[PDB]
Amino acid sequence: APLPELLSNNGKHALMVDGAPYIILGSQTNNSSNYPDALKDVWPSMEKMGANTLSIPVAWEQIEPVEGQFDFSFVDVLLKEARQRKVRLVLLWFATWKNNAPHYAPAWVKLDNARFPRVVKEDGDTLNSLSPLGQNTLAADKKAFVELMKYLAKRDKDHTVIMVQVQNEVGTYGAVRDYSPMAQAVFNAAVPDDLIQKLQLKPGTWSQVFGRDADEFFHAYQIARYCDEVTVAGKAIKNLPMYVNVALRNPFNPGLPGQYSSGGGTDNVLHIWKAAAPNIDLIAPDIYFRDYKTVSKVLELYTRPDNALFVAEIGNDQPFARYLFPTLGKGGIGFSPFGMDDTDYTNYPLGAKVYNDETIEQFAQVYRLVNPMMREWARLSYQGQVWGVAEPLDSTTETQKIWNPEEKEQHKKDRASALTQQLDLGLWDAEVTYGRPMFWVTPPEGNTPAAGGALIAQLDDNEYLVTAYKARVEFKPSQELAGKKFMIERVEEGRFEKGKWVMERVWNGDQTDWGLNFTDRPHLLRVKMASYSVQ
Ligand code: NA
Ligand code: NA
Ligand code: NA
Ligand code: NA
Numbered sequence: 001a002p003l004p005e006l007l008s009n010n011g012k013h014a015l016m017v018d019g020a021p022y023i024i025l026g027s028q029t030n031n032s033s034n035y036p037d038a039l040k041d042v043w044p045s046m047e048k049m050g051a052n053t054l055s056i057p058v059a060w061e062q063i064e065p066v067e068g069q070f071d072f073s074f075v076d077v078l079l080k081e082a083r084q085r086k087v088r089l090v091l092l093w094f095a096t097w098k099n100n101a102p103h104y105a106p107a108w109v110k111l112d113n114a115r116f117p118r119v120v121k122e123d124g125d126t127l128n129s130l131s132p133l134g135q136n137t138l139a140a141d142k143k144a145f146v147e148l149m150k151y152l153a154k155r156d157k158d159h160t161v162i163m164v165q166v167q168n169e170v171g172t173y174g175a176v177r178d179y180s181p182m183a184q185a186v187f188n189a190a191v192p193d194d195l196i197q198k199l200q201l202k203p204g205t206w207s208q209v210f211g212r213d214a215d216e217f218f219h220a221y222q223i224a225r226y227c228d229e230v231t232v233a234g235k236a237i238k239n240l241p242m243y244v245n246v247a248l249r250n251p252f253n254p255g256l257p258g259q260y261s262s263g264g265g266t267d268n269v270l271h272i273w274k275a276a277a278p279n280i281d282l283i284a285p286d287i288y289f290r291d292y293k294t295v296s297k298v299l300e301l302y303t304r305p306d307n308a309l310f311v312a313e314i315g316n317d318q319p320f321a322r323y324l325f326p327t328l329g330k331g332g333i334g335f336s337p338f339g340m341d342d343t344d345y346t347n348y349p350l351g352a353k354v355y356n357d358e359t360i361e362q363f364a365q366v367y368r369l370v371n372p373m374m375r376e377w378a379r380l381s382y383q384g385q386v387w388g389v390a391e392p393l394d395s396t397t398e399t400q401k402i403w404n405p406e407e408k409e410q411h412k413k414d415r416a417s418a419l420t421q422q423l424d425l426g427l428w429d430a431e432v433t434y435g436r437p438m439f440w441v442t443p444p445e446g447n448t449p450a451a452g453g454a455l456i457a458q459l460d461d462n463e464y465l466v467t468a469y470k471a472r473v474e475f476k477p478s479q480e481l482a483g484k485k486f487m488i489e490r491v492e493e494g495r496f497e498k499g500k501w502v503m504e505r506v507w508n509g510d511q512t513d514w515g516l517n518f519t520d521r522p523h524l525l526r527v528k529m530a531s532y533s534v535q
Contacts, residue, residue: 024334325453329388
């Protein structure tokens with residue numbers, strides 16, 4: 001069985017699993033489900049969701065509760081139960097940092113500050129965040145991580161585990177960096193040549209080179225070097241893909257480092273992280289912004305020639321489900337809503353106020369569009385041209401409903417324009433619209449709540465794979481046609497069996513007169529367009 005691998009070529013990416021591109025249609029447990037007794041409350045949600053991959057913590061405190069005394073009993077049960085359900089796993093190594101803090105480090109780590117030191121603020125107070133310059137802390141984390149990877153090397157030959165997250169939301173809240181004597185000695189000293197070279201900057205100390213950014217860039221660099229060393233040590237045992245997940249700063253209006261988690265892979269320090277940690281496969285955003293513009297900005301910033309897009313976490317409230325479409329449209333390798341278990345917890349206001357079957361169903365509905373073509377989509381995303389869009393107005397607020405005669409008419413025109421998206425597919429364009437009948441051309445009014453989206457993959461110059469949700473998709477020529485006319489040549493609904501297209505029916509007549517109209521039900525279409533002479 002070939003190792004999973006992240007491939008990067010011509011600014012595109014694939015997560016290879018069993019020798020072909022793979023899409024993580026993911027779900028992540030709540031933070032306290034990493035025990036055998038809790039798995040009963042995880043699997044039903046995962047089945048209801050139709051997820052193909054489970055993200056779940058493996059805690060340093062549980063594998064090494066007494067120094068040198070390893071316990072992999074949780075990993076044994078998890079591997080067995082995952083294999084029984086024919087799903088894959090992403091293990092989340094909760095160790096030196098989990099949300100900036102050492103709460104998941106063993107008692108013998110997190111209660112020994114002298115051996116395993118904390119960030120010291122400028123004012124001399126201590127924060128509950130382990131310093132990335134703690135050399136004992138790095139050696140201990142690395143040692144335990146190596147034992148976890150040795151367990152997988154010996155006990156996971158078919159790679160049930162496809163990827164490992166190293167730490168969880170690293171950084172520091174309440175200070176920009178470590179100002180300890182140990183840290184100041186490194187801050188005051190030369191910026192390492194390797195960083196100075198990769199960023200093409202003039203040599204000097206951190207303050208000289210980075211000015212107003214020296215504190216933040218220094219924390220980012222030391223944490224990236226720490227995480228890179230743990231990653232290299234684990235890969236030397238078994239070379240799985242490994243990644244870090246970011247406690248995002250607001251990309252538009254971030255405020256100050258330490259209000260957000262300073263030193264994590266935030267948008268302003270991706271250049272430091274990529275320079276400092278070449279062994280970490282990707283930097284994954286954890287998305288809890290609900291509003292379309294900010295989520296779209298995060299997807300743009302984290303999709304780079306040097307960075308595969310993996311939405312390692314997203315809120316589990318209804319508005320987040322539609323972001324699967326732009327994630328995959330950007331060539332994303334996966335998408336993993338957070339808190340998908342029945343362990344009596346909700347992270348509202350980040351996620352759903354209520355966790356029930358309806359919560360899960362909002363993600364199940366969009367996964368049902370991708371599951372039937374997962375391997376074909378993954379190959380097209382890597383090897384070719386894909387597109388994906390989500391409904392670009394958020395649900396109307398109570399404010400807007402009350403606080404909104406000729407204006408009503410104007411407001412409806414502005415919303416209809418905003419709810420109309422253009423995609424350039426080469427010789428053909430698609431126009432995607434949201435919240436309108438399946439017949440005639442009444443302008444779009446949006447879904448209540450906002451929920452729609454569309455996926456398109458190019459099969460050939462004039463042929464597209466299309467699936468969409470609570471939306472209309474219409475094709476037109478991309479360029480003026482010089483006397484020719486155009487039509488849909490053929491729309492087929494079907495599926496892939498053993499990688500071969502099987503037609504179920506032809507969409508025609510009402511079904512293609514008014515664009516291609518999708519509801520909540522899955523339909524996978526092959527759309528062939530034609531220009532023709534009327535000479
Ligand atoms: Na891709
Ligand atoms: Na074009
Ligand atoms: Na064009
Ligand atoms: Na079908």
